[PDB]
Amino acid sequence: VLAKELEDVNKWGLHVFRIAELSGNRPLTVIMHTIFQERDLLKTFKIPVDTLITYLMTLEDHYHADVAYHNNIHAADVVQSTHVLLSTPALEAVFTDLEILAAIFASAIHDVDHPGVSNQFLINTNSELALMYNDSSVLENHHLAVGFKLLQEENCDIFQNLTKKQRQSLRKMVIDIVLATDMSKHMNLLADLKTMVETKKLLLDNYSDRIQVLQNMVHCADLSNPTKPLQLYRQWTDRIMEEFFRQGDRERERGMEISPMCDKHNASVEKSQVGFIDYIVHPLWETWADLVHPDAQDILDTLEDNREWYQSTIPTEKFQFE
Amino acid sequence: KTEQEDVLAKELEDVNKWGLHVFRIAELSGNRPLTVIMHTIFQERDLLKTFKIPVDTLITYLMTLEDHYHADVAYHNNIHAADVVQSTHVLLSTPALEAVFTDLEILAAIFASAIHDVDHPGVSNQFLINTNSELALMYNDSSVLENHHLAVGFKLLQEENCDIFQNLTKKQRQSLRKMVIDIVLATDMSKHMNLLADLKTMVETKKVGVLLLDNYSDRIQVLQNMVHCADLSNPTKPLQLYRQWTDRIMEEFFRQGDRERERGMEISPMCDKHNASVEKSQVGFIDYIVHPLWETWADLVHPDAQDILDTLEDNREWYQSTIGQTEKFQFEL
Amino acid sequence: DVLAKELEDVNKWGLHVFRIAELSGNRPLTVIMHTIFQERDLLKTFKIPVDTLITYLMTLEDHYHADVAYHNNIHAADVVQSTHVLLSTPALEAVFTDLEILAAIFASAIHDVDHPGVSNQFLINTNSELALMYNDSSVLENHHLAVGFKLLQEENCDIFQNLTKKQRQSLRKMVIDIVLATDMSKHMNLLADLKTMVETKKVTSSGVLLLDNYSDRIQVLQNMVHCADLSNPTKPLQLYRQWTDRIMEEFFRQGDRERERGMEISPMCDKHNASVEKSQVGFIDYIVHPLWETWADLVHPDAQDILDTLEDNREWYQSTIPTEKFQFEL
Amino acid sequence: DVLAKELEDVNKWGLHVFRIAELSGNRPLTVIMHTIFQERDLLKTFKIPVDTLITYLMTLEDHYHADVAYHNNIHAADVVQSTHVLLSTPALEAVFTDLEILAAIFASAIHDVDHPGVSNQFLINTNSELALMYNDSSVLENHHLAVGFKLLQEENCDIFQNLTKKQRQSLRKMVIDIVLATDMSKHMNLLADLKTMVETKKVTSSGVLLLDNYSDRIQVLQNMVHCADLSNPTKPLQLYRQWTDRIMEEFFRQGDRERERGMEISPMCDKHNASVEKSQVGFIDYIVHPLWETWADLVHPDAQDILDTLEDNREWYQSTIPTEKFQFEL
Ligand SMILES: COc1ccc(C(=O)Cc2c(Cl)cncc2Cl)c(OCC(=O)NCc2ccccc2)c1OC
Ligand SMILES: COc1ccc(C(=O)Cc2c(Cl)cncc2Cl)c(OCC(=O)NCc2ccccc2)c1OC
Ligand SMILES: COc1ccc(C(=O)Cc2c(Cl)cncc2Cl)c(OCC(=O)NCc2ccccc2)c1OC
Ligand SMILES: COc1ccc(C(=O)Cc2c(Cl)cncc2Cl)c(OCC(=O)NCc2ccccc2)c1OC
Ligand SMILES: [Mg+2]
Ligand SMILES: [Mg+2]
Ligand SMILES: [Mg+2]
Ligand SMILES: [Mg+2]
Ligand SMILES: [Zn+2]
Ligand SMILES: [Zn+2]
Ligand SMILES: [Zn+2]
Ligand SMILES: [Zn+2]
């Protein structure tokens, strides 16, 4: 049964692919709806249930089924991971229900309508998307537009019983969160959070500090694959690489320079994963674990066990460093 | 999970708390308080794993059992059974009884609570005796209903897919069966005096952090009295709930009086709507029956049952604020 | 010390006001008022010397009766603080000027000063000096205002000493219009006017209340403090139950006075034939809910969590029931 | 204090034995045995002085090697508590006497005492004095018993002082029969006998297994402790993985010593060419699953959830795969 798998909704390491299969490819709808009930978000913001389901299905339908990694399973995973991260004891009673909703809704839409290729592929091919967004956070800008645009379809406005101020406030937060998922923003985000860990009171008594924690939270949820039970992590690696190698096949067909990690004929899958952890995932997830000491120690330890597992198996690093 | 199912699940989180809103749960479940509460308590206590009880079999039995409580009966219906089930579930987890009872003894107390008033017709044993009912004739005027409640609770195990005990060994089943019988037959009010006197004697010479109970007589004594305490637990509930229980039992009692009047029978204690004092009857019920029982219990599990005993005396005072045959009656138990 | 940690809840509906009264040494109105004024920076804004404030607040509080069980300095503190929370309601963000805000809180602090613990009609029946001065019309409410303003003239008490004449004359007007609305005989007409406002309701582009003339701005401020006054049945049940126990003791003393004197006993003042729980349900059904129902719709959906408790507490009192003509004809 | 809360789970499969070892101050065998003796009333039944029991348990436990990653006191404790759970399975209710229970529990407790963390073959090929003493046959298993019984002779350590000669001679025969059956070279015939018993299984009138001869009775107790000994994979994955890490560390220490000495490296002992997950899968497919499948048959349906976990945990090891001649041979 599906229902019995959803009981793990509050735990790190939910059987997410299992839920994907059991709900008939509706992991984003079933998990988002569970969490909305679990958090009493339908009562608080008077979201009609039919309106919520209809929107969620709509949002899910706009994730591509042929995209290996950035599809509805990835989106459900980031939504659920943010739901767990919100519930850490060191952030207890820190966020309002509007900020809670924002981080969770921002996580839901954060990759909607992904074509399975990078911003630069879109930029180099003179895509209509890159032309509209002036080669700047092309997809991340797009994910937001599509996610907000989708509220306008029949019976999809889930924010209809929010006041003007609540919609303004929510809208600003969702934008600041999803635009922080752009990787060219990782270095400054980690730095800003590095500073907060050093001068913290936990209390956050202005918008700039509050959006900043919420930004990094969803960012860690986005970069959380390596911190998961290994049998799930392994599945995230098979999926991203399948997507990456496809862009490489596409770049190669077109006579383009093949991107970092996209060459199936020259792929150090294992070495790239240690590089992802060493350069990006671990440096961030360690700074999070400081902010919320010791709430993520087992998450941090799972990360180091996976890195060691991937190391043992070793029979783009320029890109990781920058 | 529907929107009503979620609100019901939100109510069900209080299953471990005295004064659960059992009437809201009755409404929210589509009049299935006993199925939902029993199912919850079996999950919580891992009784399905422990006794390898198939889940479909457990739900099919629960519904079937609840279907044999009479909807038209005002007190001794399925909301009452669920209340005694839940109240026992709480009393079992009381700090001073921690790790005292085996898995089978726990199943026995809970199953006994569920079945203990099944198929109650709304009338006393004496009404059934005086009318020469077949029930009385079968059970020789002795614990007529209490025998019936048991007979029926065990009978329904034989319906299709209803045997929740199918994977117990003969030893396990013979033990459980004997404990359920000891517990339900203890709910007959003609047993109140001995049950309490023996409990008083236990408290007197009681060994202990948690209570030490070594032989069968003493363990069955505590279990019988615990369920007897859940059975007599209305006055110890928040006033909002206790008042509902009173209206319900008085509506039941009054129906029996009207039947007794119709038939030119003598009207039973507390069943006369043209001459009843609801409040006065409650003070008697507490002073003579419920308080001396809950006082003793609170001694046994001290100081776990302190708020409970305090609610009891607050409620007695409130019924005192608002104020013969029935005092004679209550005095002799 | 201990007080300081309770006073952090001054922006919340349900402040432990009775404990604050204990910890401050029977000085709740002074501390809660001083707290609210610093919180709203009303001293810097209006050039109020902090010693002049505290002296006046001490003076005002002293003129609340320590022997009156309900209408004392704890009730005033409670009305001040409930107005303070009601002024921060989202649907009213940036609506009211600092002067209009000072007016609301001032009015609430003074609204019951020198209350003798008996009704207008007791004063009127007995030919009291007060009823003869105010011509039997809003006797106590006129007095509360008059005392509240005359204490400004005691030593080092004039908190408005640095207000301009236009500010002073405008503040005075608003404070008067507010407190005179607390006479329960103005309730029927106050609600009618608040109702007609919800049916012809204008809202700013930011979503908040659009009030552009004086009649409507005062109207809202009148009902707000009127809601703060009748805010007991909407607080946590532990607070509410204490307010009922206090109002009745004070009602009962009035009845004892009326019996002694051969006077007809006022509704709810007979200790020998009393229905405390059922009169609470009547208070809620006929007066409080209908008022808070129309406030909720005025600030929709801000006042939902408060309306839910008023309906919760009505149920707790309803369940404990073993003067209606009075409640009806308002 | 936090220890009492963990020892509540002593009757339960999946007890947090590592957490109990940290909380007792590296005394899992002493606390766990003591708990079980208190819960089974064994001290009363056999007039075992309580100080004698503790001194013995501290002594026995002191003789498990601390520097050994798997075959240490934690493993001894784990096998004791697992047998204790298995003895209580509903399908064996009232089958075994008190002295047979005492025998299985004591046997579990002593079964790896003074284990040096290397195999018999290693002790044989290096001509150890222990191999010489035991003529290369069940070298370690003979030693664990000799030490286990030898320690009864230390000061205040004779837990069997108040047992009659008949009882002592009977307990001793049983303990020896049980521990010597923990030699893997006996696995095949022990299992073959369990299967036989399952095929010609008799239940009593009250639904528990019938065993009217010593050969049948000791078979079951041998297989029970054999099951407890091979129970790691049937534990919560979180417990199982610590067991797997600890054994492989122990195996890998021996491989390093064999390499150092120019010896052939034993199966699963080369840290440079290891398949930690493929080994657990094979360990389950060849040894653990055939054993527990047959046990779960004997005690049907008592061990269904134990068997289900086994089957979940195998699949987890398949998923983490990026020796077999040895496994199959047994
Ligand atoms: C589990 O395996 C992985 C999962 C996700 C990523 C991402 O970078 C995802 C992801 C995200 Cl969060 C945001 N912009 C694009 C993508 Cl492609 C990933 O990438 C490794 C890696 O080194 N990532 C850095 C990076 C920077 C700029 C563009 C693209 C990538 C993984 O390792 C192969
Ligand atoms: C809160 O209101 C009540 C709830 C339950 C009872 C019972 O006695 C229930 C109940 C139970 Cl436990 C067991 N045998 C029958 C019933 Cl009828 C009750 O009765 C008061 C009272 O005085 N009961 C004594 C009595 C003795 C023998 C037969 C019947 C009754 C209540 O007060 C009127
Ligand atoms: C918590 O319980 C109460 C709290 C306050 C009141 C008041 O009405 C106070 C209050 C106020 Cl606001 C204004 N003029 C006088 C008083 Cl006495 C109250 O009174 C109930 C009630 O029915 N009041 C209606 C009324 C009062 C006076 C004149 C005309 C009409 C309460 O119930 C017993
Ligand atoms: C959690 O994982 C394990 C746990 C226990 C064993 C044992 O075999 C233990 C153990 C036991 Cl019961 C009895 N004689 C020695 C040991 Cl070394 C184990 O060994 C693998 C395995 O396949 N075992 C077979 C075997 C036969 C003969 C001698 C040694 C081993 C594990 O897998 C690596
Ligand atoms: Mg993205
Ligand atoms: Mg009965
Ligand atoms: Mg007044
Ligand atoms: Mg061994
Ligand atoms: Zn993403
Ligand atoms: Zn009953
Ligand atoms: Zn007032
Ligand atoms: Zn062993």
Return the string of H and E elements of chain A.
Answer: HHHHHHHHHHHHHHHHH
User: What number of domains of chain A?
Assistant: 1
Approximately how much beta-strand content do the residues of chain A carry? under 5%
How many strand elements of chain A?
A: 0
Distance between the termini of chain A: 46 Å
Please give the share of residues in helix of chain A: 55-70%
Helix/strand class of chain A = mainly alpha
Binding site for Zn(2+) 1 (chains C, D): 75, 111-112, 229
Active site (chains C, D): 71
Binding site for Zn(2+) 2 (chains C, D): 112
Organism (chains C, D): Homo sapiens
Question: Would you write up a description of this structure?
Answer:
4 copies of one chain form a homotetramer. Chain A has 322 residues and is an all-alpha fold. The first copy, chain A, has a single domain (1-322), classed as 3'5'-cyclic nucleotide phosphodiesterase, catalytic domain (Catalytic domain of cyclic nucleotide phosphodiesterase 4b2b, Orthogonal Bundle). Chain A has helices at 3-6, 16-22, 27-38, 41-44, 49-61, 72-86, 97-109, 119-124, 128-132, 138-149, 164-179, 186-196, 207-222, 230-253, 269-291, 297-313, 317-321. Chain A starts with a helix and ends with a helix. The interface between B and D is small, with 10 and 12 residues. Bound molecules: the ligand COc1ccc(C(=O)Cc2c(Cl)cncc2Cl)c(OCC(=O)NCc2ccccc2)c1OC (4 copies), magnesium ion (MG) (4 copies) and zinc ion (4 copies). The site of one zinc ion (ZN) has 5 residues of chain B, from α6.
